[PDB]
Amino acid sequence: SPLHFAASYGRINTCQRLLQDISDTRLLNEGDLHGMTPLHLAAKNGHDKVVQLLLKKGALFLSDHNGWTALHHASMGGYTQTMKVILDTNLKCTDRLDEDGNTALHFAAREGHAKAVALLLSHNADIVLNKQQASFLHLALHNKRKEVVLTIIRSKRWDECLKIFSHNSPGNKCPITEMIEYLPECMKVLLDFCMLHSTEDKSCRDYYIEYNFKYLQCLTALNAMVQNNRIELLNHPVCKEYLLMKWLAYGFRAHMMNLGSYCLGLIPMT
Amino acid sequence: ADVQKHASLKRIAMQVELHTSLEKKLPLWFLRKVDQKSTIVYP
Amino acid sequence: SLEMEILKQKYRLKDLTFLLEKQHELIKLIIQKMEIISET
Amino acid sequence: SLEMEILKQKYRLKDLTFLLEKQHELIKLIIQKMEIISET
Numbered sequence: 001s002p003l004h005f006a007a008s009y010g011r012i013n014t015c016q017r018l019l020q021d022i023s024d025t026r027l028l029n030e031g032d033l034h035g036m037t038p039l040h041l042a043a044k045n046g047h048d049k050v051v052q053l054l055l056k057k058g059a060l061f062l063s064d065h066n067g068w069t070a071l072h073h074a075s076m077g078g079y080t081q082t083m084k085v086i087l088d089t090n091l092k093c094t095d096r097l098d099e100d101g102n103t104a105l106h107f108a109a110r111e112g113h114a115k116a117v118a119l120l121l122s123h124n125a126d127i128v129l130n131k132q133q134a135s136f137l138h139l140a141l142h143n144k145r146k147e148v149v150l151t152i153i154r155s156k157r158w159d160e161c162l163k164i165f166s167h168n169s170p171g172n173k174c175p176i177t178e179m180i181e182y183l184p185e186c187m188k189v190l191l192d193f194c195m196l197h198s199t200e201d202k203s204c205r206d207y208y209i210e211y212n213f214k215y216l217q218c219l220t221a222l223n224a225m226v227q228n229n230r231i232e233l234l235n236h237p238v239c240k241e242y243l244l245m246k247w248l249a250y251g252f253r254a255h256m257m258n259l260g261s262y263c264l265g266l267i268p269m270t
Numbered sequence: 271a272d273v274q275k276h277a278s279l280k281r282i283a284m285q286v287e288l289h290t291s292l293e294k295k296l297p298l299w300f301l302r303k304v305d306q307k308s309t310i311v312y313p
Numbered sequence: 314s315l316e317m318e319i320l321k322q323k324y325r326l327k328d329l330t331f332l333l334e335k336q337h338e339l340i341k342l343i344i345q346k347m348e349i350i351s352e353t
Numbered sequence: 354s355l356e357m358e359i360l361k362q363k364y365r366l367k368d369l370t371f372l373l374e375k376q377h378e379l380i381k382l383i384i385q386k387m388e389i390i391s392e393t
């Protein structure tokens with residue numbers, strides 16, 4: 001009991017007295033009524049000095065009744081200074097899975113802790129699906145975590161965060177269609193990166209802008225923007241240019257040949 | 271006044287529905303030849 | 314006015330949730346420094 | 354009603370943020386007068 005209270009409330013001097021009295025490690029790893037341990041209690045409430053002291057005393061990254069780690073609690077609460085203590089000391093901890101297949105990155109993302117997602121994602125955390133075949137990026141999208149997904153889109157890992165999804169799932173689809181479905185202002189941000197400006201000089205006759213269509217293709221994204229009433233995404237320059245490209249590609253020539261086939265009966269009759 | 275209310279979406283919806291219908295009918299090799307993953311424009 | 318009557322109410326709620334976040338961190342500072350004797 | 358509904362919403366939030374600021378003064382008065390021994 002007394003160390004679970006002292007660790008849970010950050011009582012660093014009470015811990016130093018409890019651990020000098022109880023110099024054996026059996027007290028330092030005891031199991032709470034819900035299966036937690038002093039190192040979990042400290043990380044859950046976010047005490048960087050205590051979780052550090054318990055690791056300096058040689059506590060172990062044991063797992064909850066639900067299989068959660070001290071890093072899963074630190075992430076669930078968004079306590080990035082406690083995560084930094086753990087991610088400094090034992091980098092091998094970073095990819096451990098709970099009883100349901102979530103990582104700490106799936107917890108930081110679901111709960112909306114953008115800077116905790118940034119820290120685990122930059123500490124080379126393993127992007128993966130849990131037992132419900134869902135990514136951390138899906139868990140952010142399905143909970144409307146705008147600052148989490150802007151962090152994931154602005155990430156040096158975005159195109160890796162995009163390729164890791166279940167193609168066989170109707171519930172956890174192509175992440176670009178899930179952004180149009182749940183978080184369309186994050187899709188405005190993602191399409192702004194598809195416009196490249198080649199002068200910063202709009203008065204120059206030679207000025208040009210380039211549009212890249214890699215997020216509109218695998219008309220799935222525009223069907224999805226129509227089926228979700230995303231009128232301010234339909235009216236974006238990259239969408240107006242993708243459709244006008246599709247019309248000049250084949251659709252104009254398709255329509256003009258139907259009309260030209262009809263005119264060949266119509267005009268000779270008049 | 272209700273066609274002109276919904277018009278802004280309906281026009282893009284009509285274009286999207288036209289092109290998807292054509293792309294379901296046309297052959298994959300022609301789409302791979304004739305589709306174009308990026309375009310430059312001069313304002 | 315509602316296109317801005319709701320907008321300032323967003324910012325007043327945002328500075329309220331900021332004040333509650335600053336205050337939650339002082340309640341923890343109390344329990345961390347508090348002289349717990351005769352209750353343990 | 355919304356042209357005066359949101360007007361009362363403003364005032365309930367304005368007197369809520371007043372109460373939260375009165376309470377933030379009392380929590381600082383605790384840490385200021387609080388007896389700290391052991392946890393220094």
Ligand SMILES: Cn1cnc2ncn(Cc3nc([C@@H]4CO[C@@H](c5ccc(F)cc5)C4)no3)c(=O)c21
Nearest residue numbers: 243244247251273276277278280281284285288
């Ligand atoms: C990309 N693009 C650039 N110029 C284009 N011209 C033609 N097409 C094909 C095409 N147009 C159309 C019509 C346009 O107006 C639509 C309309 C407006 C308001 C309403 F309320 C209802 C219907 C219907 N239906 O299909 C292109 O795709 C294209």
